Amino acid sequence: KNYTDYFFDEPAFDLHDGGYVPLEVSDAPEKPLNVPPLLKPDKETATDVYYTVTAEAGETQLLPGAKTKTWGYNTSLLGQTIVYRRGQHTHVTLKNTLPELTTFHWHGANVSGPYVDGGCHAPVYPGESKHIDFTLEQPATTLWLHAHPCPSTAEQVWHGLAAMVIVKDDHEASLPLPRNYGVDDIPVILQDRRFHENNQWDYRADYDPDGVAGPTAMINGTINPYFDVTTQKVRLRFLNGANRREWRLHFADDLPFTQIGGDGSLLPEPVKFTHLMLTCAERAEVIVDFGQYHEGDEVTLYTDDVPLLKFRIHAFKPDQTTLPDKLFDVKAPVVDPALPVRHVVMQGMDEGVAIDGKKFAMQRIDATQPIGKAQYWDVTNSNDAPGMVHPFHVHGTQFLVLSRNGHAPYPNEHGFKDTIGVNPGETVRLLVRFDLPGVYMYHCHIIEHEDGGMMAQIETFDPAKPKQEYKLMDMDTLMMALAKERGVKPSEIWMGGMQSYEKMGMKM
Template sequence: MKNNYFYNETNFDCLDAAYKPLLPIEQKSVPLRVPPLLRSEQHDNHVSHYTIVAQEGEIQILDGPKTKTWGYNGDILGPTIRFTCGETYTITLVNQLPEVTTFHWHGLNIPGPIEDGGPFAPVKPGESKTITFTVNQPASTCWLHPHPCPNTASQVWHGLAAMVIVSDAHEASLDLPRTYGVDDIPLILQDRSYHDNQLDYQRDYDADGIQGNVALINGGVNATFDVTQQRIRLRVLNGANRKEFRLHLDDDLPMTVISSDASLLPKPITLTHLMLTVAERSEFILDFSDYKLGDCVVLYSDDCPILTFRIKEFARNKQNSIQTNFSMAPLSTTHEFL
């Protein structure tokens, strides 16, 4: 079984005259960086408290000098932030960057313009702001990124992005992988260009969106992931500024897609090829039960390898067939398609 990407190929970004293809990097592989989970500083009166700091950093990406980057609570990208439907959160947002930024919750159904973190919610350098909101939406994969005008693209290019996972009682009742970092893995896909190992946004600037030849996955290159469970769930975000990612496994291992931007699908869809446009999210399950110890399976975007799955000894636990129906009573009238 093979499928196309369900898009008109004449509109693919690779046909644009300014397109920069992803190219393999000739350096040793490294373990996939799995972002840590953001921990609550306190929990009182059913309110969880977090602090998120936008800061400058430095990290080893390519061989040679380290790359100067920006990140949330670290050198690049940020911790994974987990929210639960019905819960309330108070978050202190701190700006340690040399310019104004905002903290935009892409995909969260929360009030604006301040809590949402759009262009009208600036946090100046050296200052902080505290917001409070209640999460009321189905389980989904969202993300946090800056949204200051006109520097959104530049700040994302420098490394500001973090995955956000929303859970609810319905999703928790389903037979899905959900052990974070083991069989529930966040993947932030991006592309970059480097000049003596450094980013130069102005040098690479394109009014239609900046591109690069180097594929990043969770802020690194040539990543490997050791598979110890027969089924793993990948939460994939296209965090690039412009590039489309056209995903497939080297042996056409099927991807069982269970979720898109807003929520779980009514039922899984099996694909061998999946395209994600900018800011799009998808969750899919890979079933490695037919593989043996020592096998390797490679995830590609077009012709560029981006992640190698190394099959290890599977843990002994129940991992049966993938649930075939995710239907639920609607959370509200805005989610009747579920």
């Protein structure tokens, strides 16, 4: 009924790592949580919407003293929240005003690959504009935008390129959920950073091939935030946007909250928690009820023993409303019995990370699957011992979770998901269908692992057609371009991920 324990295997948690960086409460003064504005469309009708999404360098006051140099989408850090709607024709102008190339990846959006998907093979160069057009046919959910060059995605997310994407549909608009964005429905983008001299970031100084975590939590680009509650119920859209950290979320007083949404859909039924764990790139939407609190009270959201976000309780209109027993009808696609069970094995830690025995190669296709055909994917984490949880992510689909070592999925995994935490020794079985042809990455979403090789890619295809040609990114193109952009020789260019490739004697 009420889940008081984190689901993942406790001995594998990040906090047992030899080089774990605990979070430390910053000295900085507490302040209102930043809620990113809603990106104003250029233009909108019932059928169409037009946006311009602009990657940009700038500065952001994060700590007392100097501004921290940051990157962002239509703002200096993170990004304004982008809203998309099932069935609506969407036109996005991607505009790079940074000094380096970037990529615009719509994490969890079921769009064509490899260009609209905006992964490794979709560079936008400084000064360039690219136009994309798509229509999403997927249920309401919380997705996100982040940068995806291969490598280094980790550098560009650390700089600050991430933004929440909200997907609306008609069914979700019929439900009795908080939805007044910025008042009772808010992003809780969870991140960490380490601040250095003059409050700057230095990804390189902090590089660790097993995952970069700093001591200072940063929620929606804010240090020591607090939220003014003016409603009995608040909807929190949790996003783990850290490069590696696991968030182990729970309130003072064990105040319960009820998860209503996962990565790719509403959950079929609400699930009540007191303690909720999220690995990288996972989303969880929860409803918190503040009815048992007096005006003037204060409630604190923690991760482990560390306070993250304070809820200040003001006067609120009482709210009767209960959630229905059924939020969402999961229609599971159908597996053709003549397909194999695909088996995908994540191996290694630190610099040794790999999938199915190999590190990612941007030019090499690792797998194929025909479109419109669901297949069972067995996904294994080989790590022994106590080891670690790797969050596995697949571009271009939302899957369903069928089993964890032959037993039931976790209670909040009965809806659609694009990212899944896999414990050491574990095999999760997934039901994976790709509606669109293209090239799509699959990988660990600990971002240093991804950059450091724990990545592969699948070509999805129409079996009624000849093989397609895709211009794939090559490493020489990337390093000439970054060399020109930084004003250096290709041989002095540094990128997060290189060290993992170099040390195992492997060619990026």
